[PDB]
């Protein structure tokens, strides 16, 4: 068996190696790289994503979220409160402004350190899940916004054509911004490019523990258990890696820095969070290996976990028996 620590593997593929995205995420498995949940993804040094960074800045973020934790300081959740809209350019300002920025720090382990300690005392603003793309039209090898659709995935592996799109989502931060522990939509595999800024760190749970990291959230959080039997499909729960270890939740860590890649793999559970602005571009895709994760995955029906249009289908097909019920929590 291949990788069977489970530890993140990091992937430097020639430009020859770079034109098939598929054949290159089968090779990463034929050597264990999902075990870990989480791979990196060097790009050869001869791509790049796009000319220049230079006109960003009249994007707009519709709904910047103010993320408020409550807890205690390795085990906390955020909601999300809803700010004014403002531009890119006037978000990057603000990130830099002496209230949110970056403290002096002087290595990745040492602010990592000052984000555990310091997180719950501060509520930085995230600009997430904005739908479009960086990536220049002519861009040709792992161009977020050319992908195969898990829409045809699913029909070429089943036969059955369904409704539904899959488009990219841009991702603003800053210091402290953070996601929580989740797995991506019905356990589907994501890929994060950090276009441009300061790091992402990440954690990441092997797929074949994630139920002993679900165990501990329902001790950890015991009123948010009770409440829904998926709640970590809520996308607010955090658990810090000193955490993890007290109570033998095997994890590993990895820092992301602007210009690579990282691909989460089906019932992977991640968390991390943003060193400083930064933009990040995101989008989920399948596989046929993910198939059968998507049968199995689990499902938040109490009303909370509200998703796409394009997660009818999947639920419809691939869980029919669930379907009625989990249509109800999205109606
Ligand atoms: O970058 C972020 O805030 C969160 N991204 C992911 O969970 C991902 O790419 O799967
Ligand atoms: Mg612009
Ligand atoms: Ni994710
Ligand atoms: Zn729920």
Redesign the pocket.
């Given at each position: 068996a291949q990788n069977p620590n489970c530890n993140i593997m990091i992937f430097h593929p020639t430009k020859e190696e770079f034109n098939d995205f598929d054949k290159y995420i089968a090779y990463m498995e034929s050597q264990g790289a999902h075990r870990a949940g989480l791979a990196k993804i060097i790009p050869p040094k001869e791509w790049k994503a796009r000319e220049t960074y230079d006109n960003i800045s009249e994007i707009l973020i519709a709904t910047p979220l103010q993320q408020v934790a409550s807890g205690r300081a390795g085990v906390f959740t955020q909601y999300h409160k809803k700010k004014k809209a403002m531009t890119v350019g006037e978000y990057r300002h603000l990130a830099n402004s002496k209230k949110y920025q970056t403290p002096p720090h002087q290595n990745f382990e040492d602010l990592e350190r000052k984000y555990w300690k310091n997180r719950i005392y501060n509520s930085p603003i995230?600009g997430?899940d904005i739908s479009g793309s960086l990536f220049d039209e002519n861009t040709k090898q792992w161009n977020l916004g050319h992908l195969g659709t898990i829409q045809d995935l699913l029909e070429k592996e089943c036969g059955v054509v369904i409704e539904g799109v899959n488009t990219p989502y841009l991702?603003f931060?800053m210091w402290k911004?953070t996601?929580a522990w989740?797995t991506?939509d019905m356990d589907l595999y994501?890929?994060?490019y950090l276009h441009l800024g300061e790091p992402?760190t990440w954690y990441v749970v092997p797929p074949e523990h994630g139920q002993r990291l679900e165990r501990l959230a329902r001790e950890l959080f015991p009123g948010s258990s009770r409440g829904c039997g998926a709640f970590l499909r809520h996308k607010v729960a955090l658990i810090s890696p000193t955490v993890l270890k007290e109570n033998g939740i095997p994890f590993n860590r990895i820092t992301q820095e602007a210009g690579e890649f990282?691909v989460?793999f089906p019932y992977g559970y991640?968390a991390?969070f943003?060193h400083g602005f930064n933009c990040?571009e995101?989008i989920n895709f399948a596989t046929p290996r993910w198939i059968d994760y998507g049968k199995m995955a689990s499902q938040c029906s109490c009303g909370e976990a509200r998703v796409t249009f394009s997660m009818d289908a999947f639920v419809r097909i691939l869980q029919p028996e669930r379907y009625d019920l989990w249509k109800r929590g999205q109606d």
């Open positions: 995230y997430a991702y931060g911004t996601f989740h991506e994501s890929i994060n992402k990282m989460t991640h991390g943003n990040a995101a």
